[PDB]
Amino acid sequence: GHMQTLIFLDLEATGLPSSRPEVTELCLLAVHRRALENTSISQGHPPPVPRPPRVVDKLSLCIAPGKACSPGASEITGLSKAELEVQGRQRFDDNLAILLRAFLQRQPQPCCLVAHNGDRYDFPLLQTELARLSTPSPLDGTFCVDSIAALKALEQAKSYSLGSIYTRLYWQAPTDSHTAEGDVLTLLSICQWKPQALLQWVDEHARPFSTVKPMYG
Amino acid sequence: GHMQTLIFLDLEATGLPSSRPEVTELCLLAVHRRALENTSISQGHPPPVPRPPRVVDKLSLCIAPGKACSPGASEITGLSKAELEVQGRQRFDDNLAILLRAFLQRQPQPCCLVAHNGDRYDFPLLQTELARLSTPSPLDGTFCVDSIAALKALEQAKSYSLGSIYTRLYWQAPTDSHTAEGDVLTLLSICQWKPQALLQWVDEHARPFSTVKPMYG
Ligand SMILES: Cc1cn([C@H]2C[C@H](O)[C@@H](COP(=O)(O)O)O2)c(=O)[nH]c1=O
Numbered sequence: 260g261h262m263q264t265l266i267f268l269d270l271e272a273t274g275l276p277s278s279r280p281e282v283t284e285l286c287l288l289a290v291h292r293r294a295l296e297n298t299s300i301s302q303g304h305p306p307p308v309p310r311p312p313r314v315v316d317k318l319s320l321c322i323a324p325g326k327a328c329s330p331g332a333s334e335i336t337g338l339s340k341a342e343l344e345v346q347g348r349q350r351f352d353d354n355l356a357i358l359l360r361a362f363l364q365r366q367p368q369p370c371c372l373v374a375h376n377g378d379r380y381d382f383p384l385l386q387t388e389l390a391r392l393s394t395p396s397p398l399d400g401t402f403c404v405d406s407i408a409a410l411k412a413l414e415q416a417k418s419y420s421l422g423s424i425y426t427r428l429y430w431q432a433p434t435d436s437h438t439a440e441g442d443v444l445t446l447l448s449i450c451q452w453k454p455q456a457l458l459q460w461v462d463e464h465a466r467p468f469s470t471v472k473p474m475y476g
Numbered sequence: 477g478h479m480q481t482l483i484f485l486d487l488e489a490t491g492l493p494s495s496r497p498e499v500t501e502l503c504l505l506a507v508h509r510r511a512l513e514n515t516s517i518s519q520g521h522p523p524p525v526p527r528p529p530r531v532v533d534k535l536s537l538c539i540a541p542g543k544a545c546s547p548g549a550s551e552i553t554g555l556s557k558a559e560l561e562v563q564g565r566q567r568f569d570d571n572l573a574i575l576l577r578a579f580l581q582r583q584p585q586p587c588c589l590v591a592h593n594g595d596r597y598d599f600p601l602l603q604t605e606l607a608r609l610s611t612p613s614p615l616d617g618t619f620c621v622d623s624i625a626a627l628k629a630l631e632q633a634k635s636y637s638l639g640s641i642y643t644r645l646y647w648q649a650p651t652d653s654h655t656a657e658g659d660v661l662t663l664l665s666i667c668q669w670k671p672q673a674l675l676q677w678v679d680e681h682a683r684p685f686s687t688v689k690p691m692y693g
């Protein structure tokens with residue numbers, strides 16, 4: 260093995276890729292590889308939803324966008340530009356990059372970001388947001404992985420939405436859907452199903468986050 | 477109506493004040509004044525446990541102490557120096573101060589830290605840990621308040637442990653006791669009981685954190 264830290268990540272945003280979206284919420288959940296392994300091999304039909312590991316670093320932040328959320332985006336996320344602004348939320352700026360860098364620096368390296376549909380949404384969007392900044396990217400030196408690819412490779416060894424996978428494994432609806440922390444915790448639970456095989460796959464397929472093409476711009 | 481952000485805070489540590497303890501876990505939950513103001517005033521006996529605000533900044537970090545946790549502290553917190561270290565946790569250091577600074581910077585000012593038994597434990601300890609650092613304290617300019625004194629004023633208008641207050645108000649046991657984030661979320665729930673009245677008291681009684689004497693030298 261080699262990845263020492265897995266950082267489960269989700270974003271909420273103003274809309275879909277075609278609308279050229281801006282991030283409205285992000286959550287990072289850093290778990291050491293040993294904490295993942297030390298979840299039991301899921302047993303029972305269905306297995307109970309596992310508790311997160313005790314030792315965990317968490318960062319969840321709301322972010323004011325420069326453009327308004329779409330009707331459908333505000334509906335599912337429960338966030339709006341006006342509500343983010345009135346509650347004094349700041350934009351995706353240099354101070355946020357320092358925050359992210361300092362958080363990431365507290366983790367043993369190498370680090371791998373894990374996001375559901377990360378390759379098509381979360382990673383390219385995050386790359387676009389960071390490229391606007393004047394500070395060096397805080398995610399330089401870090402690696403990344405799409406959990407959908409992970410689950411597909413583990414499963415094969417129809418819907419692949421986060422909710423559908425979770426309900427298939429646990430026979431329960433996920434909670435706090437379409438919130439950054441809620442979806443991160445849901446993703447964690449899914450990745451605790453076969454953590455030893457997951458980490459093995461992650462070490463095999465982790466790519467530099469610097470190779471991720473920006474969504475736009 | 478001056479405090480713009482309330483930051484609910486809890487620490488886990490290696491032991492009791494007399495042992496000269498070190499921080500092992502910290503959680504900050506930043507909530508804008510408006511999110512507390514617009515929480516439903518609790519009605520019924522007992523009232524339901526209040527819903528957390530949608531818009532929230534959360535920071536939860538595990539910290540490797542220099543000295544071991546007491547057996548009793550390990551039992552209640554679920555944390556040990558040994559486990560914190562094997563999982564690559566870093567000390568309370570300069571990088572952590574930078575991380576805290578950047579988190580606080582994202583919050584509209586003036587800010588007020590809210591901690592249960594904060595005056596005797598959390599605030600002096602955090603002051604001691606920050607005093608060890610070469611870089612200036614990021615909490616200079618932030619205010620602080622003890623929620624025990626708050627609830628003593630609100631209730632009176634014998635136990636004041638976090639758990640006792642929660643069960644008295646909601647006729648429910650608190651979840652995830654003696655974990656930084658667990659205790660922060662419990663503290664939030666208690667503070668959402670009479671949130672307008674809590675905010676008014678905080679406005680009148682909040683003191684600069686820079687006036688907090690360190691627990692030990
Ligand atoms: C699933 C979905 C997401 N989105 C946008 C808004 C969300 O903040 C963002 C991230 O998706 P998520 O909520 O699955 O994490 O994508 C839509 O606009 N419509 C949709 O149906």
Ligand SMILES: Cc1cn([C@H]2C[C@H](O)[C@@H](COP(=O)(O)O)O2)c(=O)[nH]c1=O
Nearest residue numbers: 487488489490491492548549553654659
């Ligand atoms: C309540 C309690 C706390 N402590 C120490 C360990 C905890 O990490 C620290 C913070 O208290 P807390 O768990 O109530 O937040 O105080 C004890 O040593 N013994 C005790 O009985």
